[PDB]
């Protein structure tokens, strides 16, 4: 029916109205203090008043660090922007890692804008261009104006254009009897399609036929747009959508990230502030989640020390699973979690404890009832023994071969013999390492 | 204007100083560090005089002891019209610009050129626009009546200005500003006639406005260079500007200064965590400071006897001794209980959080015992736990709950040292399973 | 349509650093670096022009100086496939010989089908009837420049941004 | 008013007509032998007969190597091309370091062109073109405040006039030699045709229409190298917007070099051009990679190479890019054998005191004698540069208490406020957690 | 007139006899008799042209004359034979690979020689009239072409007309048309019409009106290396990439096509192969990959004779961890014949300093020359070779013509060599920055 991939049994933190975490809610088992801290920073983000506040999820493997990040992402909803990231993302071959970090910082600051649009739409009735006196005079255009007759429901207008809007209009290859959509904000036009007032069954151009647009030709409509600040920086860095030379030429060069200057960010922030102060725009800060923060080298941490002190900084969530590991890019600096102490002083470390055997068993129960599999209680106890003996993830990823070996024997339930056969077929890390030690030629 | 939610340095209005450069115990959001504040005031006065150039001053001390706060206060007391570049140590390791090119751009971003120019403008409220045209539109005659609160007039317009008025459509009751020389008509909105909104302009219609323009030398370098346009200021694709244009803009700036058409405005370039630049960057720095068109470089670092990048030895503050010879060093000190208490009270006032006195004393005690920034983060964390219980004043129990939930450096490294077997060490060894 | 970001500029930089006038030598240096000291000038480097015309087989010896003094897009637009004499060092590649034959070749030909695998992939996977998935979020024109009191700035900006050619 | 940045108290090497250096002349105190050697090198440069002459001045930090190179550049005058360079700048992300080394080599060889400037400006009163669709010429009349003057014009300048939208009554600018056309604006007499108009109205030029002026143009060989080597194409007159494709620096081949050289030599043989070789100055030569040293080996054997001046502040130091090559001043023994080493000496208390006195009197500061002795004691104890850099905070603290003189108390307060390297290192060693 | 006094500009060829016996002092260079004989054998190798892909190696101490020997063989090579000189640091580029950089350095030094007959008609245009047919497909033109001595009239085709409308003439410009090939150029405007247009313009220029016979016969020999053919063939407009170095990893198939067509042109008889020498300064700092490409590319037919210079001893090779003789591995050294340049004595140093003084227009007394010879005996030779010019500058500082003992002594006192500077460093090591950066800036303990 659906598709599940190591997740989607988590719907949220599952807290009460007072912030106290229930034991089994939202697909979570245990981690009561971690879920309470995640709820506290959920209320901090929903307060929408703080900038440059960061937490660090510390713990072993298979303890629920990334699951907590998906939980806060689901608890905030899709309205607040969430930017998942990995420590290996920032090493780009087209721009420096500082610029990639700043772009991902600006990609977590959303913006809601109620934008008005001037729209001229209707069915094209006439199309008559007037020529110039000297078309080969070097300067000037070939034509002077273009008369367009637009007719919609209960309205009919005659439009006299410049050459410039007509270049974009004839770029779409419109004709007589096609309904168009002249957006007067950017000058961009859209060929809506053929009209069904004329014939339909005599075309070879796989066309679509739309009726006459309701209302008058000239319109002013309100559109609610949800953009980020990084999209504004990108759109001003590589400008497209105007009716000039560079706006054409920007859509045909190969896309490439550039080092966005700080002056452009100031100008974007100034016009965003004047949008908010007019009552038009609304600022929605979000979360930048960086999984495996220990993969970063020392220079990105050094720039993070400044970027967490900026005034439009988002809330950053880091996850690490190192005890006492030297930071990459250095030789002698030994630091907790692979995170240097000058940024660790700015963090708020949240500890994530491991699980007990009963927690393993009920996590296996939840993953069996999410993956649409029915298991016996003896096989459930055997898989709890797997989780407490080898790994939690090894017991998690052995449900589906057990189900398939049950289905190939024409059965729905899973028995202990199925788990024994799945033991015989598939190995774990410990048994593979054990067969790697007593090996003939590097097995 | 200048949007910001809450910054870590948002409480620093400026350097707290008197008329005799004497630091107050508490003023403008800065408490403590009296000698460092006096030294930064001396730095600020030397920038304000502007008679010298290319003097590097280094700020060093323990971490989380007023280092970046001093530069924030310096930039705040500098005010507008003076440039203040704030780059980090990792900001210059680019892929399209060399390290010396990035340092030269950062140097030339911090010196201003101040030009005052005068332009006539027409700004008023449009009463009525009458435009008559022929059948083919060969000639267009137009009469535009326009008014202020003090006077009104009727203007006869030629065909180009008619073409500039039907473009960017101006109706009755709108207020516009007309640049007569360039034809730039900007609609400021609508006036108070409903039956945006902005008041009708007063005084004379033709106002002679003198606008004081400031610009950086790096801005004129890309403009005078013909390989790239002005968009390289915005897309950041200047791409290794040559030096032959730099001598031209330097000589033209000297000629403008001699002729009185422009005046120089020296500024401050601030580099925080300067201990991460290479030795090549320092070798560019120590000769870039001996030029007349150079700013006052503020350097910040917290290392002590560390390895210099690109070498094998260790140097004091991560910098070689020639650059330390060219620098004057401001040393910052640590904080006592009273200074930490006043800093936390300032952060509580700035974050709109009401605190109990006993909760403030507990926060001060745990700030002394662990860290200033840990208390400065818990002071905003605990307000949400207080609002979960639905009361305004944060009590001791909320701070205790926030201290229990969110760990600090020492408790976390103690838990890590207790459970080293469950984490991944330097050899990549880990034990995930509970039993055996 | 105008960009909301306004990059103000003083007049003095434009008059004394870009526009030629009596007190500067922008035009004189432009003539010195583009005309007199150009290595493709046939009045001073006729031997080099003869060498390059023997190499490329160009019929006009003034074409290299014309190419080196015009921008790239203007060179792209009026590029005309003039005839080149066969007694020259310019050759034909193997790939150009495959490409020139298959310009007007119809289907069911060996060279035409072997040289048009991308159009066969286009019509095989029904690429002319697939809906557009992605659209950009923000679209913006290039940054406007205002100079308070200079119509030459507006004329040059309108000439560059709306080049008729 | 005036800006002083670690220099500008020096104006030259301060020698006499016999090449002997005096005690305190030209802003230089002491260093007689190095100054006389630099004067000999300056005279060798002014002889304009030798190529690839390379010297290296080596000494301790804060001894005056950059001041000596600056004095060489001041003594040579602004006519001779001078290229300051720091050995870190040769490393580039667009071209190889050796290409930048040759580019900086050819930035130090200059040319002198004696050109003319003929300018016609004024209001257009008659613009009458005649053809035979192909225009033959155009008679253009220009009017200024001192009369009018008629001009015949070629059709290319007529096409450029049509490009600039020039009508009757527009004040225009015509350069004769290059055909430059600039439209200043409409004349002020045509400002009342409309009550409100988009055109700017400039007045009549108060001088004559025809203006002739003799100029002198100074270009370098690198400028002519980069003028013929534009990969995208030639730029137009005004491009305020940038090129659509970004022009990066290119591997400028050797084939362009002798063509530019033979064009320059043909112009020199006609007597139009005058060749002035100059000075390339590289500071911190120890920062160079050994491959740049290898190219400095072969680039000093060329026929057009300038005089190369190197500076270093190192002793027995390993060369960059190597493992087991310990060599003096960071320079490999291949390059030292082609160099001439100029010794640089440290100073005593008297030279330090007089240097501090000169730096005080160039910054318009009044110091007392006892404050000067304390400044000299501080300069001997800690560093010369520390005592030089503490002069201006002393002036600030003297201006704070409304005095025009610097006393001992200001010196003590300023030495308490700011620390040198030694005191900061002593604080660094006896501190617990990272200072 | 754009060549000042270089490091070795006195050398003009190899001072040999007809029997390849080196003269003791002739053609600018002194001594090195076995090296001169071997370099003359290599000169006969290159001038014979019947061999390809041979590597030699001049190896000696510093300041001995390996690059002097190669400069002599370049000057005795003569014109129209390609000689390129690169360093070991030229190969390491950013956007361009190393092995293709040796490919370009190999193909820059082997050329082909072509010739053609040019019949130039160069004069000043008096009048061009065009006859147009009713159909307009073909147009006849009458051209009145003029020089100072005689003027004639020619008939033109339609392609002449449409090529003359481009780069438009206006009855008084000077052009040159080839009768054989139809090449069209505009030489500029004649000086007789310099005062007719009152404003000079931009796209034109003034040259003098040519004189003499209008039809001039002249053959022109072009020597083109294979690199120009590769760069031209790689692009639609390849001369810009030829003069800006933007070739960018030319493919192997166009090189194979160019090699095959050059071979068939040699078989036809249009061109003849002119080989040359590739000379590499300081070949010890090439990577081992560069050495692998060097020892493979010397077995191809279109490969020049490569000569390399090395002054290192038994040092390490870059890219590896071992040490090899001359800094070059053993699989390259057996693909070479070794040239050894030996150190000089007092007589040869005296003769070289006398030649350097005579070439630099510096006159020395006998005792000053003997003192400079003694200084070049105890120190190296280039120290004296700079001391002569410095002492000359001291000599006209003394208002004296010749260079005496006092000028040489003052120049020796003012400027230091390597050994005295090493002694001054090692006796004053506290004031100088060491390997670990420790220094004592202050003068008071
Ligand atoms: N409290 C929990 N309830 C249910 N499943 C959990 C819980 N904690 C962890 N898991 C499961 O354990 C796996 C590891 O979690 P994750 O955070 O993604 O990686 P890690 O814990 O190694 O950082 C996930 O697949 C998740 O489904
Ligand atoms: N004098 C002061 N007044 C107010 N706040 C201060 C003062 N000194 C330090 N702080 C606070 O201490 C924190 C750490 O200081 P900061 O300069 O950012 O770090 P570092 O000192 O490591 O560079 C800052 O958030 C700052 O607000
Ligand atoms: N003879 C002198 N007269 C005046 N000032 C001097 C003299 N020698 C050195 N100085 C000063 O010493 C300072 C350091 O010298 P500089 O050349 O800049 O660095 P370094 O000597 O380390 O290369 C300079 O600012 C210069 O003004
Ligand atoms: N045999 C020689 N005859 C004349 N001059 C020589 C001779 N050998 C060396 N020289 C001169 O010595 C100078 C430096 O020697 P060089 O040839 O650079 O040594 P190396 O070949 O070891 O690099 C050169 O300018 C050269 O003219």
Swiss-Prot record, chain B:
Organism whose genome encodes this protein:
Saccharomyces cerevisiae (strain ATCC 204508 / S288c)
Query: Which biological process annotations from GO are given for this protein?
Result: box C/D snoRNP assembly; chromatin remodeling; DNA repair; protein stabilization; regulation of DNA-templated transcription; regulation of transcription by RNA polymerase II; rRNA processing
Q: Which family does it belong to?
A: Belongs to the RuvB family.
Q: Which Pfam families match?
A: TIP49, TIP49_C
Its recorded name reads: RuvB-like protein 2
Q: Which reaction does it catalyse?
A: ATP + H2O = ADP + phosphate + H(+)
Q: How does it assemble?
A: Probably forms a homohexamer. Interacts with RVB1 and may form heterododecamers with RVB1. Component of the SWR1 chromatin remodeling complex composed of at least ACT1, ARP4, RVB1, RVB2, ARP6, YAF9, VPS71, VPS72, SWC3, SWC4, SWC5, SWC7 and SWR1, and perhaps BDF1. Component of the chromatin-remodeling INO80 complex, at least composed of ARP4, ARP5, ARP8, RVB1, RVB2, TAF14, NHP10, IES1, IES3, IES4, IES6, ACT1, IES2, IES5 and INO80. Also belongs to the R2TP complex composed of at least RVB1, RVB2, TAH1 and PIH1. Interacts with SPT15/TBP.
**Top EC group:** hydrolase
EC number, UniProt record: 3.6.4.12
Where is it found, in Gene Ontology cellular component terms?
Answer: chromatin; Ino80 complex; NuA4 histone acetyltransferase complex; nucleus; R2TP complex; Swr1 complex; TTT Hsp90 cochaperone complex
Q: Please list the GO terms describing molecular function.
A: 3'-5' DNA helicase activity; 5'-3' DNA helicase activity; ATP binding; ATP hydrolysis activity; DNA helicase activity
Give the matching PANTHER family.
RUVB-RELATED REPTIN AND PONTIN
What SMART domains does its record include?
Answer: AAA (SM00382)
Q: Where on this chain does ATP bind?
A: 61-68
State what changing residue 67 to R does.
Growth defect at 37 degrees Celsius
Where is it located?
Answer: Nucleus, Nucleoplasm
Q: Which UniProt keywords apply?
A: Activator, ATP-binding, Chromatin regulator, DNA damage, DNA repair, Helicase, Hydrolase, Nucleotide-binding, Nucleus, rRNA processing, Transcription, Transcription regulation
Curated annotation (Swiss-Prot), chain C:
Q: What subcellular compartments does it reside in?
A: Nucleus
Subunit note: Component of the chromatin-remodeling INO80 complex, at least composed of ARP4, ARP5, ARP8, RVB1, RVB2, TAF14, NHP10, IES1, IES3, IES4, IES6, ACT1, IES2, IES5 and INO80.
Write out the function statement from the record.
Answer: ATPase component of the INO80 complex which remodels chromatin by shifting nucleosomes and is involved in DNA repair. Its ability to induce transcription of some phosphate-responsive genes is modulated by inositol polyphosphates. The INO80 complex is involved in DNA repair by associating with 'Ser-129' phosphorylated H2A histones as a response to DNA damage.
Misc. remarks from the entry: Present with 1110 molecules/cell in log phase SD medium.
Stated family: Belongs to the SNF2/RAD54 helicase family.
Domain writeup: The DBINO region is involved in binding to DNA.
Q: What is this protein called?
A: Chromatin-remodeling ATPase INO80
Q: Which organism is it from?
A: Saccharomyces cerevisiae (strain ATCC 204508 / S288c) (Baker's yeast)
Portion held of the full protein: 1077 to 1241 of 1489
Swiss-Prot record, chain D:
A GO term, aspect molecular function: 5'-3' DNA helicase activity
Reactions catalysed, semicolon-separated, are:
ATP + H2O = ADP + phosphate + H(+)
| Gene3D superfamilies, per the entry | 1.10.8.60, P-loop containing nucleotide triphosphate hydrolases, RuvB-like helicase, domain II
**Which superkingdom does the taxonomy of this entry point to?**
Eukaryota
Which InterPro entries does the entry link to?
AAA+_ATPase, P-loop_NTPase, RuvB-like, RuvB-like_C, RuvBL1/2_DNA/RNA_bd_dom, TIP49_P-loop
Q: Which key words tag this protein in UniProt?
A: Acetylation, Activator, ATP-binding, Chromatin regulator, DNA damage, DNA repair, Helicase, Hydrolase, Nucleotide-binding, Nucleus, Transcription, Transcription regulation
Listed under GO biological process in this entry are: box C/D snoRNP assembly; chromatin remodeling; DNA repair; protein stabilization; regulation of DNA-templated transcription; regulation of transcription by RNA polymerase II
Top-level EC class, please? hydrolase
Q: Name one GO cellular component term.
A: nucleus
Q: What is its EC number?
A: 3.6.4.12
Q: Where in the cell is it found?
A: Nucleus
The record's principal subcellular location, in a coarse class, is: nucleus
Keyword match Magnesium: no
Give me the residues that bind ATP, please. 59-66
Keyword Nucleotidyltransferase present in the record's keywords: the answer is: no
Misc. remarks from the entry: Present with 11600 molecules/cell in log phase SD medium.
Q: What does this protein do?
A: DNA helicase which participates in several chromatin remodeling complexes, including the SWR1 and the INO80 complexes. The SWR1 complex mediates the ATP-dependent exchange of histone H2A for the H2A variant HZT1 leading to transcriptional regulation of selected genes by chromatin remodeling. The INO80 complex remodels chromatin by shifting nucleosomes. Its ability to induce transcription of some phosphate-responsive genes is modulated by inositol polyphosphates. The INO80 complex is involved in DNA repair by associating to 'Ser-129' phosphorylated H2A histones as a response to DNA damage.
Q: What is this protein called in UniProt?
A: RuvB-like protein 1
The organism is Saccharomyces cerevisiae (strain ATCC 204508 / S288c)
**Name of the coding gene:** RVB1
């Amino acid at each position: 029916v659906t598709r599940t991939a190591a997740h989607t049994h988590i719907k949220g933190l599952g807290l009460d109205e007072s912030g106290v975490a229930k034991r089994v809610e939202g697909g979570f088992v245990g981690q009561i203090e971690a879920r309470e801290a995640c709820g506290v920073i959920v209320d901090l983000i929903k307060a929408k008043k703080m900038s440059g506040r960061a937490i660090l999820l510390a713990g072993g493997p298979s303890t629920g660090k990334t699951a907590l990040a998906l939980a806060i992402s689901q608890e905030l909803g899709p309205k607040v922007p969430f930017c998942p990231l990995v420590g290996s993302e920032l090493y780009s071959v087209e721009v420096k890692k500082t610029e990639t970090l700043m772009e991902n910082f600006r990609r977590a600051i959303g913006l809601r804008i109620k934008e008005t649009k001037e729209v001229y739409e209707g069915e094209v009735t006439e199309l008559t261009p007037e020529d110039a006196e000297n078309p080969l005079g070097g300067y000037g255009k070939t034509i002077s104006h273009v008369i367009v007759g637009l007719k919609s429901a209960k309205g009919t207008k005659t439009l006299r254009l410049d050459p410039t809007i007509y270049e974009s209009i004839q770029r779409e290859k419109v004709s007589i009897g096609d309904v168009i959509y002249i957006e007067a904000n950017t000058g961009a036009v859209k060929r809506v399609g053929r009209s069904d007032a004329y014939a339909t069954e005599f075309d070879l151009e796989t066309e679509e036929y739309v009726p006459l647009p309701k209302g008058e030709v000239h319109k002013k409509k309100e559109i609610v747009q949800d953009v980020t600040l990084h999209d504004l920086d990108v759109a001003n860095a590589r400008p497209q959508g105007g009716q000039d030379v560079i706006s054409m030429m920007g859509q045909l060069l190969k896309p490439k990230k550039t080092e966005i200057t700080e002056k452009l960010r100031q100008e974007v922030n100034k016009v965003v502030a004047k949008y908010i102060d007019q009552g038009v725009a609304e600022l929605i800060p979000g979360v930048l989640f960086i999984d495996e923060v220990n993969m970063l080298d020392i220079e990105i941490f050094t720039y993070l020390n400044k970027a967490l002190e900026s005034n439009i900084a988002p809330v950053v969530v880091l996850a690490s699973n190192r005890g006492m590991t030297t930071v990459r890019g250095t030789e002698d600096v030994i630091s907790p979690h692979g995170v240097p102490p000058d940024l660790i002083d700015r963090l708020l470390i949240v500890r994530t404890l491991p699980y007990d055997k009963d927690e393993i068993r009920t996590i296996i129960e939840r993953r069996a009832t999410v993956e649409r599999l029915q298991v016996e209680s003896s096989a459930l106890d055997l898989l709890a023994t797997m989780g407490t003996e080898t790994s939690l993830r090894y017991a998690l990823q052995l449900l589906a071969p057990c189900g398939i070996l049950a289905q190939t024997s024409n059965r729905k339930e899973i028995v202990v013999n199925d788990v024994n056969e799945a033991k015989l077929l598939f190995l774990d890390a410990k048994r593979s390492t054990k067969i790697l030690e007593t090996s003939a030629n590097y097995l | 204007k200048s949007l910001s939610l809450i910054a870590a340095h948002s409480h620093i209005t400026g350097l707290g100083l008197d008329e005799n450069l004497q630091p107050r115990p508490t003023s403008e959001g800065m408490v403590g560090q009296l000698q460092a504040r006096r030294a930064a005031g001396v730095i600020l006065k030397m920038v304000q005089n502007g008679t010298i150039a290319g003097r590097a001053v280094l700020v060093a001390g323990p971490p989380s002891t007023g280092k970046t706060a001093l530069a924030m206060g310096v930039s705040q007391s500098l005010g507008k019209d003076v440039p203040f570049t704030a780059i980090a140590g990792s900001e210059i390791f680019s892929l399209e610009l060399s390290k010396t090119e990035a340092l030269t751009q950062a140097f030339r971003k911090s010196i201003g050129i101040k030009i005052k120019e005068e332009t006539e403008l027409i700004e008023g409220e449009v009463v009525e626009i009458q435009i008559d045209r022929s059948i083919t539109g060969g000639h267009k005659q137009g009469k535009l009546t326009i008014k202020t609160t003090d006077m009104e007039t009727i203007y006869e317009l030629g065909n180009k200005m008619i073409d500039g008025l039907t473009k960017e459509k101006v109706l009755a009751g709108d207020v516009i500003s007309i640049d007569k020389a360039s034809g730039k008509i900007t609609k400021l909105g609508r006036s108070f006639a409903r039956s945006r909104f902005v008041q009708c302009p007063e005084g004379e219609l033709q106002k002679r406005k003198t606008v004081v323009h400031t610009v950086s030398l790096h801005e004129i370098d890309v403009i005078n260079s013909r390989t790239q346009g002005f968009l390289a200021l915005f897309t950041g694709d200047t791409g290794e500007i040559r030096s032959e244009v730099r001598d031209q803009i330097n000589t033209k700036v000297a000629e403008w200064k001699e002729e009185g058409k422009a005046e120089i405005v020296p500024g401050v370039l601030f580099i925080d965590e300067v201990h991460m630049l290479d030795i090549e960057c320092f070798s560019f720095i120590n000769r870039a400071l001996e030029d007349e068109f150079a700013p006052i470089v503020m350097m910040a670092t917290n290392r002590g006897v560390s390895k210099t990048r690109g070498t094998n030895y260790k140097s004091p503050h991560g910098l070689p001794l020639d650059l330390l010879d060219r620098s004057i060093i401001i040393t910052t000190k640590s904080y006592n209980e009273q200074e930490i208490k006043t800093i936390l009270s300032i952060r509580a006032q700035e974050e709109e959080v009401e605190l109990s006195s006993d909760a403030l004393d507990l926060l001060t005690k745990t700030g002394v015992e662990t860290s200033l920034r840990y208390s400065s983060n818990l002071i905003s964390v605990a307000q949400q736990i207080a609002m979960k219980r639905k009361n305004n004043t944060v009590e001791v129990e909320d701070v205790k709950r926030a201290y229990l939930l969110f760990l600090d450096s020492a408790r976390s490294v103690k838990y890590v040292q207790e459970n080293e077997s469950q984490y991944i060490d330097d050899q990549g060894n880990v034990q995930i399973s509970i039993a055996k | 349509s105008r960009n909301p970001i306004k990059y103000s500029l003083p007049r003095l930089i434009y008059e004394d650093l870009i526009l030629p006038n009596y007190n500067n030598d922008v035009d004189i240096a432009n003539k010195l670096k583009n005309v007199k000291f150009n290595i493709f000038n046939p009045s001073t480097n006729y031997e080099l022009c003869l060498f390059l015309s023997k190499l490329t087989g160009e019929p006009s010896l003034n074409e290299f100086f014309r190419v080196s003094t015009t921008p790239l897009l203007k060179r792209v637009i009026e590029r005309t496939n003039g005839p080149k004499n066969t007694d020259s060092l310019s050759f034909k590649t193997i790939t150009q010989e495959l490409l020139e034959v298959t310009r007007n070749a119809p289907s069911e030909g060996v060279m035409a089908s072997l040289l048009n695998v991308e159009k066969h992939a286009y019509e095989r996977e029904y690429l002319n009837c697939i809906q557009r998935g992605y659209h950009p979020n923000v679209s913006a024109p290039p940054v406007t420049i205002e100079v308070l009191g200079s119509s030459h700035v507006t004329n040059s900006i309108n000439n560059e941004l709306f080049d008729p050619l």
